[PDB]
Amino acid sequence: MGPGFDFAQAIMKKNTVIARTEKGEFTMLGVYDRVAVIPTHASVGEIIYINDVETRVLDACALRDLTDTNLEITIVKLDRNQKFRDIRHFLPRCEDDYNDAVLSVHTSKFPNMYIPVGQVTNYGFLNLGGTPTHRILMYNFPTRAGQCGGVVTTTGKVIGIHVGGNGAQGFAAMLLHSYFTD
């Protein structure tokens, strides 16, 4: 509908796949080469389904900060025959608050879904499903099951992936440029 939705659509149309684990279907953001991200609660194993195709997992790393606190991001390298467009130059370098964000989801259940979530707070600490978690972004939208892995963007920046909600607020794990240096 406007330039925020334009940037979000450009990311969804080239840099997302549908990932399926034993814990469900997730929006999965591809970042560069065969490297993608998914919420750690997806419990990625040795094999994952990517757009309903059986795919070997070459590496999976559940990130934690240097206090050994959960970040809720798993970085997955996929045994896929095709690379993602490199979007690392759209990742923020530092923790920050944002205005006017969009949460975008693409699954069998929720195809082509875009939500204007508005103002995003650097929330920091969250007890997420009983797990102490750091680098959490918060938005005041009643997100639901089915939105986990959804991409949070502003114009020009890919800032997080949706990892939970409390019925009134939604929560994303930050993406930082430093997670994807090679």
Side-chain angles (χ1 to χ4, degrees):
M1 252 197 176
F5 291 109
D6 209 10
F7 182 80
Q9 181 175 256
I11 298 297
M12 293 310 291
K13 283 172 174 276
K14 287 291 169 172
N15 280 81
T16 66
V17 298
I18 300 177
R20 176 177 289 277
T21 72
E22 296 180 329
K23 306 272 201 295
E25 233 178 35
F26 299 84
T27 304
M28 166 177 267
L29 179 73
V31 178
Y32 74 108
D33 291 350
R34 297 167 290 169
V35 176
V37 292
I38 189 171
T40 298
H41 72 254
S43 301
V44 179
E46 297 293 328
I47 302 169
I48 192 166
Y49 273 45
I50 300 298
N51 296 335
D52 279 305
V53 175
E54 190 189 5
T55 303
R56 282 189 293 273
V57 174
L58 297 177
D59 188 52
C61 177
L63 298 180
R64 304 185 67 90
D65 72 14
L66 294 182
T67 69
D68 192 26
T69 308
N70 180 46
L71 291 168
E72 201 52 24
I73 302 285
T74 291
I75 304 178
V76 180
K77 191 162 176 186
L78 300 170
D79 198 1
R80 195 152 178 261
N81 68 355
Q82 178 184 179
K83 300 180 185 57
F84 298 116
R85 177 195 182 188
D86 188 346
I87 57 165
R88 288 180 287 183
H89 58 288
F90 300 137
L91 300 173
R93 262 125 194 273
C94 62
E95 305 183 15
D96 211 352
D97 319 276
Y98 299 88
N99 303 305
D100 195 26
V102 172
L103 168 60
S104 49
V105 166
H106 189 84
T107 66
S108 301
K109 185 185 190 186
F110 291 150
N112 300 303
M113 169 178 286
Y114 298 80
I115 308 170
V117 293
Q119 261 196 20
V120 180
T121 303
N122 180 358
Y123 192 90
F125 173 91
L126 183 68
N127 191 344
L128 175 67
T131 298
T133 304
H134 286 164
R135 286 187 179 149
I136 292 286
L137 300 166
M138 182 273 288
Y139 30 90
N140 283 292
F141 190 91
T143 60
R144 310 207 212 121
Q147 280 144 207
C148 287
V151 188
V152 189
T153 63
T154 64
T155 69
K157 291 183 260 53
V158 179
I159 69 170
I161 64 161
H162 188 74
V163 296
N166 60 26
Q169 303 167 316
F171 298 106
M174 291 178 189
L175 292 171
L176 296 178
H177 186 84
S178 56
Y179 298 165
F180 304 104
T181 65
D182 57 338

